[PDB]
Amino acid sequence: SVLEEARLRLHVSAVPESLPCREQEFQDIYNFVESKLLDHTGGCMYISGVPGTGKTATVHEVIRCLQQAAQANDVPPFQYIEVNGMKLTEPHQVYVQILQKLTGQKATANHAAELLAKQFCTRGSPQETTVLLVDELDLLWTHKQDIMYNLFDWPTHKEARLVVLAIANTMDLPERIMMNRVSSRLGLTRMCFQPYTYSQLQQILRSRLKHLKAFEDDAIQLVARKVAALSGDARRCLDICRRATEICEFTIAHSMEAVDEMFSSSYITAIKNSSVLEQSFLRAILAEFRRSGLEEATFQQIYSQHVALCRMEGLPYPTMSETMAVCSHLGSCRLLLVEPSRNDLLLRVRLNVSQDDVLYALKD
Amino acid sequence: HTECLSQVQRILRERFCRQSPHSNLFGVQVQYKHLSELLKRTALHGESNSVLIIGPRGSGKTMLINHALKELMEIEEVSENVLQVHLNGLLQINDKIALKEITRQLNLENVVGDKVFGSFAENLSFLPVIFILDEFDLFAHHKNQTLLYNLFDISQSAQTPIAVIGLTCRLDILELLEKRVKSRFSHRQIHLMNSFGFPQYVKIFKEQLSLPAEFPDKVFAEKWNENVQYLSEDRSVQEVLQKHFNISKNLRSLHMLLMLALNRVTASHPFMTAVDLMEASQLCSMDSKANIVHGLSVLEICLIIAMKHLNDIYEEEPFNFQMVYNEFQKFVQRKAHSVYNFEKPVVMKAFEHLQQLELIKPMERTSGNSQREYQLMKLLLDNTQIMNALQKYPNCPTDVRQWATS
Ligand SMILES: Nc1ncnc2c1ncn2[C@@H]1O[C@H](COP(=O)(O)OP(=O)(O)OP(O)(O)=S)[C@@H](O)[C@H]1O
Ligand SMILES: Nc1ncnc2c1ncn2[C@@H]1O[C@H](COP(=O)(O)OP(=O)(O)OP(O)(O)=S)[C@@H](O)[C@H]1O
Ligand SMILES: [Mg+2]
Ligand SMILES: [Mg+2]
């Protein structure tokens, strides 16, 4: 079916071959790495960008192009090694991972570091240029900063023949997280990926759905515009498109439903579906807050206000245990803030949502 | 006779205590339809999805998953290809233990290895399997959320199909995740609320206490159905149900109340009565503080009255043993010759016993520097509670009562 084909095309893992939306950045990286590969000299580049900008996809596509060029005997052969920071149980274990990727030897963290140091500092046998990719750099931080210093200092050696690309989300990292000597080592080589404009998002969506007339232009334009105005991320755009397809299986209404179901908060409807006693408790809290003006109140005054409200409403007199159970249930779903493990009558209560939202939910 | 009572007791005890699966589903038609449809999509094809289910505890979160699995696993031979892994946040508190449980459940310990080696690339390199994550909120409190990130990554990868299911009671589960995993998390959420009125709750109660059609005796089953139907419209039973429904709409409390009601079913009374439900509701709705106060002694009552007087004179301020002793001495000295000639150590032991029952708690705890005397103590009771408890005290003397009134 057409909807099934659109769902298949719009999946996240269905990476395209090459989209010129980032062709400029691709070209810049293609010049830099090509220069580092032609001169038999190492280098380092730091790239910072918000998630969803295609950093990993762009790097992998550049690696694919470089490997294809090497296969066409135009570039000297190179060894590619990829490591992910968040896929490692311990920080020091990255030394074992790289060593096992290059020689397959098993050694301790310190011994693996020493062997890697010996290989990268001593004039050994002439090896292929090493392309090292490290993902999620900020998660390799250590109070001693030895791992980061070694990672960004080793390619400085002529014998290293190592090119390192660091992908991260924060551009401030080399300034406030990295010390001076290594900050100057990554200085002036910082690539920032700006978020896609709504035109770029529309171009990407059109490329996803070439030769397929399944969505109207209006839904596509609105989805790209919401994405631009909220995060400018292709991942949530694909999720919205898939949800719109699912709802259409059941127009602009589908996209609106997707965006206001996957982004909007459910606090209002949760309060609406609350019980009568919980509503009375919330009203008592609001009345006590208006009387006092403070954002913290003990359980005793709230209980007194609840008893007064119940007397006004004609409800039966509530026991302390019942009110405590209701409060504990409310705190379980993170609508309030309380520590009722030991304190019972002296519990500080803070609202987890804005007062105006509570008023707008309770007026109806 | 006795055999029928034993069989029905066993069946209802299995229904309530163990929470055995039942075909009856209440107000969850759309949610179950969505969940089953997505499970079938993930099973019959290589596509991957991630879903979180949010609801209050005791709202049958596990029942939906169990019913859907029992409905869809036995459709075809897909269950042979389908593998299921269940993880609970309580049993697995560390990533090492979670990895060990994952390896043992997959019967890959022979492939991966037996020793305590920290390498997990044996599974990672090799990696349809479905994942069930009980208490998903606890996993977000780990040091680095490595397991959750890896699961999301393999779900988003194009290597193997993986289905991830998480259970959460917190409504703020979206803000407990890091930016990366939140971006990689497919925003599929299902909310389990008791969105039904009181008459629907009455229908649920009527159906739950109804014998199944597979019971051997049919005329007795029909008579039981007639009894429960007749008991359905009784205004005392309706009043008890209305009270419990006002308190909370969770089905777990209703199951507990029904179980306690069935405990009073004997041979002489094969069919229940509204008075039985009244007794069960009364037993289920008693406050513990008044019960604790009722079991005290005279000296403790006098000390508590002195404590209330201290709280009244000094508005919301702490106190120590010396002031209470001084004003108890004042009370026993105003009276001419009352029989309360007690020394310091017995009063000190009484205060220690009162503090042991955790009716009084210290402030800014310290020891050695400050003795038990001259220590800031506070009371954890309300004046109306004391008055109500003292009203029901069996043999409260007139003197102490009038002192309390003063
Ligand atoms: N050139 C591109 N044009 C359009 N969409 C793209 C492009 N490159 C990547 N994408 C899409 O955007 C998604 C995000 O790509 P990633 O590289 O994984 O994100 P990232 O920028 O590396 O940030 P994280 O936090 O590391 S996932 C990809 O999975 C694709 O679906
Ligand atoms: N929609 C429903 N259909 C059938 N039974 C339900 C439904 N909702 C709740 N229940 C019943 O409610 C009772 C209590 O639910 P539980 O199964 O104890 O909660 P849970 O699903 O285990 O969630 P947690 O957070 O793990 S305690 C069970 O006996 C369920 O059969
Ligand atoms: Mg990435
Ligand atoms: Mg459960």
Per-residue three-class SS string for A270-312: HHHCCCHHHHHHHHHHHHHHHHHCCCCECHHHHHHHHHHHHHH
Q: Where are the beta strands (DSSP E) in A37-88?
A: 43-49, 78-84
- H or E stretch covering B189: strand B188-191
Question: Are the C-beta atoms of residues A86 and B146 closer than 8 Å to each other?
Answer: yes
b/e map A104-139, b = 16+ CB within 10 Å: eeebeeeebbebbeebbeeeeeeeebbbbbbbbbbb
- H or E stretch covering A40: none
Q: Which residues line ligand 2 (CB under 6 A)?
A: B 19, 25-26, 28, 57-63, 167, 169, 251-252, 255
Backbone angle region of A124, left / alpha / beta, with phi > 0 → left and psi within -120 to 50 → alpha: beta
Q: For chain B, give me the number of helices (H) and strands (E)? A: 21, 7
Report angle CA A22, A25, A26 to the nearest 5 degrees: 80
List C-alpha distances in Å: B51 to B38, B41, B54: 9, 13, 10
- Which tokens go with A290? 């208006």
List C-alpha distances in Å: A5 to A9, A333, B68: 6, 40, 27
Report angle CA A338, A339, A341 to the nearest 5 degrees: 140
Interface check for B253 against chain A (CB to CB < 8 A): the answer is: no
Question: Are the C-beta atoms of residues A90 and A109 closer than 8 Å to each other?
Answer: yes
Q: Which residues contact B47 (CB under 8 A, 6 or more apart)?
A: A11, B41, B161
What type of residue is A37?
L
List C-alpha distances in Å: B287 to A325, B282, B385: 11, 11, 10
List C-alpha distances in Å: B385 to A33, A352, B305: 79, 31, 12
Q: For chain A, give me the number of helices (H) and strands (E)? A: 16, 5
Report angle CA B154, B156, B157 to the nearest 5 degrees: 60
The experimental technique behind this entry is: cryo-EM
Question: Are the C-beta atoms of residues A233 and A193 closer than 8 Å to each other?
Answer: no
Give the nearest chain A residue to B188 (CA atoms). A262
Q: CB under 8 Å, gap of 24 or more: what pairs does B276-281 form?
A: B277/B236, B277/B237, B277/B240, B278/B236, B278/B240, B281/B240, B281/B243, B281/B244, B281/B257
**CA-CA distance, A340 to B179, in Å (whole number)?**
31
On the 0-12 / 13-18 / 19+ scale of CB atoms within 10 A, B357 is exposed
**CA-CA distance, A285 to A262, in Å (whole number)?**
30
Ligand 3 centroid–CA A284 distance in Å is 48
Interface check for A11 against chain B (CB to CB < 8 A): the answer is: yes
Strands B83-88 and A129-135: unpaired
Question: Are the C-beta atoms of residues B181 and B152 closer than 8 Å to each other?
Answer: yes
List C-alpha distances in Å: A101 to A82, A175, A322, B308: 9, 31, 62, 74
Interface check for A322 against chain B (CB to CB < 8 A): the answer is: yes
Backbone angle region of B76, left / alpha / beta, with phi > 0 → left and psi within -120 to 50 → alpha: beta
Question: Are the C-beta atoms of residues A169 and A50 closer than 8 Å to each other?
Answer: yes
Which residues are registered as beta bridge partners of A162? A130
List C-alpha distances in Å: B337 to A281, B334, B398: 50, 9, 15
Size of interface A-B (CB pairs under 8 A): 90
**CA-CA distance, B51 to B167, in Å (whole number)?**
9
Backbone angle region of A114, left / alpha / beta, with phi > 0 → left and psi within -120 to 50 → alpha: alpha
The CATH number given to B6-191 is 3.40.50.300
Segments in B83-234 forming alpha helices (H):
95-105, 109-112, 121-126, 136-139, 146-156, 179-184, 198-208, 218-232
Backbone angle region of A188, left / alpha / beta, with phi > 0 → left and psi within -120 to 50 → alpha: left
**CA-CA distance, B383 to B51, in Å (whole number)?**
50
**CA-CA distance, B17 to B5, in Å (whole number)?**
17
Which residues are registered as beta bridge partners of A298? none
Which residues are registered as beta bridge partners of A48? A168, A192
* Residue among A329, A336, A346 with most chain B CBs within 10 A, to mutate: A329
DSSP state of A87: G
Question: Are the C-beta atoms of residues B146 and A89 closer than 8 Å to each other?
Answer: yes
Backbone angles phi, psi at B166, to 5 degrees: -125, 150
